[PDB]
Amino acid sequence: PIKLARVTKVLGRTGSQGQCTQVRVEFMDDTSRSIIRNVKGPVREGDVLTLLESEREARRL
Amino acid sequence: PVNYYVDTAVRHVLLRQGVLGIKVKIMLPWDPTGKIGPKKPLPDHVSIVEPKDEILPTTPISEQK
């Protein structure tokens, strides 16, 4: 299923050239839930991300 | 400040085996008058004056003259 998540805190810049951004995201359906995600493109705190597959987690720096 | 604080001169002298070149640079001193130096100071030189002595007031005194 497709899920929506809210960006709580921006963590850092990842990638070979720094193209990706590592952030912390909390699910809308369950406010207790929180994971770490890699986002492509400009992103700031409060943005809403559409997770097609919400089980994957990213290796934080 | 190089334009008005530095005086430059380039000369050539012919010696037996060829030409020698001479370069001379002189940095002028600051002079309030324009006789032997630039009138204006260097841009980054700040001169803060020493405060004068002030008598500490003790009792209100009214002087009429």
Binding site: - | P41, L42, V46, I48, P51
Partner: protein, 132 residues
Amino acid sequence: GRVRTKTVKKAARVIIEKYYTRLGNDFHTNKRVCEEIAIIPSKKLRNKIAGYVTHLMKRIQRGPVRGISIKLQEEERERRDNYVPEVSALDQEIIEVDPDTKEMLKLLDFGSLSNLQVTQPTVGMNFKTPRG
């Protein structure tokens, strides 16, 4: 970046040292005082010096600064430093001592003190950090 070069900082510190009374927290009054007292051949340099003087004055009002010290501030710190309690903190009606301390006092013919109270020493001798 907005880092101030050492020229601005040195001029501001000297101005605050010499004319602390005339300055305040207003940038415009400070910049009017600076041109009165100091010789700055530039308008932008004067504005930078005044803007640092205002920040430094606010910092001084918050508390002491690591750098300059004002004569009035030093004199007031002397008054704050002559603070004296009504009673001495050394005065105690009962002072607890170990038996070895009492023996040391006795060897100096001071075993007749009434303020002394002998406390039981710790039973176990374990005062070292566990090596590992």
